[PDB]
Amino acid sequence: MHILVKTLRGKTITLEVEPSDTIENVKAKIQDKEGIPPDQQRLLFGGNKLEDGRTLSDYNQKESNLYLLLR
């Protein structure tokens, strides 16, 4: 499922990921396109923060917006 990875600056990053992929695996996939260490990354879906290890199907779909906050 092709989902969008956005920031509060206005940047966007379309990354292809399966529903079984985790937040630690999603942050590791962002390193191949953006080049940021996964420890400095802080993703969030909805109003809640995404915890590294849990699968993407728990937070829940195609063409979604995940906001990335750098550390």
Binding site: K6, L8, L69
Partner: protein
């Protein structure tokens, strides 16, 4: 306050600025948008303040008396058509399309849409089209912020609410008062002077959340908005609408509509609540008690608009496609009720009595959330 008193006052002000005699407006149904554009622009603002004698030559079912109500109704539908490249719309609200530059004369057309909307207010004719809650605040020269971003972009709003409610200094997050701007390549754009080298902290996180929300709600429609208000203010000056709010101005433009309580309850979903829940039954007793004037304000408070589709509450639309009216169980009796216009969801707390619900909801739809 009383909206009937405010509308009656505004109608008196227009009657004083009105001009004598009338003007001819000739249009056709086939090329209505372009005919109307050529016609409205051929006249001066003082001529557009005279009586609008509109005609649809060669249209059975209309006569050579006044036909302005059918013109204002039909033309408002064609304004939303995406082929003109001015507004982006949902199939079957008006959001200015940032790619309107495609139409080389788009700013000339936005001035005409400015005159059209100011002419509907002045002449007391209703339109069957409406802008977003923040856009009505733009017309009223009221400040825009994070609250209004939820309607246009809910996930950006949700990311900003996390920054507001969580500790950025403990989490150690790199954020500056600057945003991306493109046309070739991309460059930084400061929100405040020297914003790019000003780290967002706990002291100024509220200022940052405001300035980003304000930017996001007008990032690529500045010239278009500026062109719209050139046309608006030359017919009706914005100063005449200062005593109205974004919900009153919508009803002043779109007119009053009788809401069907049966179609409302039949096509209403419930989150963590049942149809037989004490609070859900008190809510429909409240809707039945209040006058249509307050039912429209309750509908506006939950969905973001008094307008409804020709189909009904079954064809109700949200931000992510079709979403029916929802009532969610959230909080405790101490809380005030909240809403999510993107999903038409009402966050109703579990109150202990009907009078508490009647006092809390009636106050929340009048005084709004802050």
């Amino acid at each position: 306050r009383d909206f009937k008193a405010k509308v009656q006052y505004f109608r008196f002000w227009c009657q004083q600025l009105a001009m004598p005699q009338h003007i001819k407006i000739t249009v056709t149904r086939k090329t209505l948008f372009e005919d109307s554009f050529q016609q409205i622009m051929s006249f001066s603002p003082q001529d557009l303040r005279r009586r609008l004698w509109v005609i649809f030559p060669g249209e059975e079912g209309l006569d050579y008396g006044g036909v302005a109500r059918e013109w204002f109704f039909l033309l408002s539908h064609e304004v939303s058509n995406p082929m003109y490249c001015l507004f982006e719309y949902a199939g079957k609200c008006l959001q200015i399309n940032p790619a309107s530059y495609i139409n080389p004369d788009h700013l000339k057309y936005f001035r005409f849409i400015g005159r059209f909307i100011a002419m509907a207010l002045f002449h007391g004719k209703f339109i069957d089209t409406g802008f977003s809650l923040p856009f009505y605040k733009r017309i009223l020269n009221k400040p825009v912020g994070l609250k209004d971003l939820e309607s246009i972009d809910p996930e950006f709003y949700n990311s900003l609410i996390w920054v507001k409610e969580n500790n950025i200094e403990e989490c150690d997050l790199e954020m500056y008062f600057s945003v991306d701007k493109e046309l070739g390549e991309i460059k930084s754009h400061d929100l405040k002077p020297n914003g790019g080298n000003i780290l967002v902290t706990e002291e100024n996180k509220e200022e940052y959340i405001r300035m980003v929300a304000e930017w996001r709600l007008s990032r690529g429609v500045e010239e278009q908005t500026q062109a719209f208000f050139e046309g608006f203010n030359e017919i009706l000056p914005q100063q005449y609408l200062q005593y109205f709010d974004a919900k009153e101005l919508e009803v002043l433009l779109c007119g009053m509509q009788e809401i069907d309580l049966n179609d409302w309850q039949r096509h209403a979903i419930y989150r963590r609540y049942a149809r037989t829940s004490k609070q859900i039954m008190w809510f429909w007793q409240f809707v039945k008690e209040i006058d249509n004037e307050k039912r429209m304000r309750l509908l506006q408070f939950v969905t973001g608009t008094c307008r409804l589709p020709v189909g009904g509450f079954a064809d109700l639309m949200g931000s992510n496609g079709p979403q029916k009216f929802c009532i969610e169980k959230v909080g405790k009796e101490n809380w005030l009720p909240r809403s999510h216009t993107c999903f038409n969801r009402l966050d109703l707390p579990p109150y202990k009595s009907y009078e508490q619900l009647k006092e809390k909801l009636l106050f929340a739809i009048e005084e709004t959330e802050g």
